[PDB]
Design a protein around this ligand. Sequence first.
Ligand SMILES: N[C@@H](CCC(=O)N[C@@H](CS)C(=O)NCC(=O)O)C(=O)O
Ligand SMILES: [Co+2]
Length: 282
Amino acid sequence: KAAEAVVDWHKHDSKRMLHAVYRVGDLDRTIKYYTECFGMKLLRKRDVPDEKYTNAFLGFGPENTNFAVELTYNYGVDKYDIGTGFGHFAIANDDVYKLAENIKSKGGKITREPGPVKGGSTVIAFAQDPDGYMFELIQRADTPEPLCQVMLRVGDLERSIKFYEKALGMKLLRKKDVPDYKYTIAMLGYADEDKTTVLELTYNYGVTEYSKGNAYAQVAIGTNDVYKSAEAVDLATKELGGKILRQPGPLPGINTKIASFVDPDGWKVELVDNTDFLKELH
Ligand SMILES: N[C@@H](CCC(=O)N[C@@H](CS)C(=O)NCC(=O)O)C(=O)O
Ligand SMILES: [Co+2]
């Protein structure tokens, strides 16, 4: 009954990955690292005295067409627990050797030198940012979206795949078992992997739990209707696990419609009305 209506809604909606929200010890240091090392643009910066924080938004295009990072600096907080579940963000670039050497020149940290992925052929590298967040660098010819993954570790890959499909209308774009290194990955999202930001979920054999830390906050996803999309989440959570945190509705005074929830592993997602999202983008 409702599963049919959910499918129809996921088909009719136009969802978009908006941004990853996470916390940084030193906002200026991170801005400088992302602009100089990673070639990101500083898009917006907002100081919020009343609530004791400053945000900065960065990415490779404007927030109405691109995925961004939303950095949260909390006054007088200089470090966070990354935790063991948070994987990495990824940046696609047409010359990862050029990019890695740029990062090294600018005084950044390359933790994995550029070259083919172990037992694959895609050229990758890894960088670490000032707070310890890992960035994968992925060689890719020409994408509209260089900020192209958020990677989270999960305890049951099949339960997570079903959840993102049913709760969020994501397509399973890729599933790859790597038994020589005892992991399996899935890529989920709303368009071809090479054109979009995917959620990459990693399962390590026999590992069922990870710490969520207090550094990574959430990923926000846009929808034409947070109430219809939250109904789909509600149904999925009844079957698969996870929990609605904030029921769908406008924020006090602003009339910006949001809902939020956690997945079966406890990772937080915020759904934001696609039009109301635009109200802050200036
Ligand atoms: N135990 C790893 C398993 C996933 C993994 O190793 N992924 C690949 C990329 S899909 C990687 O980081 N490989 C390192 C390399 O190629 O050196 C994790 O949880 O992060
Ligand atoms: Co990755």
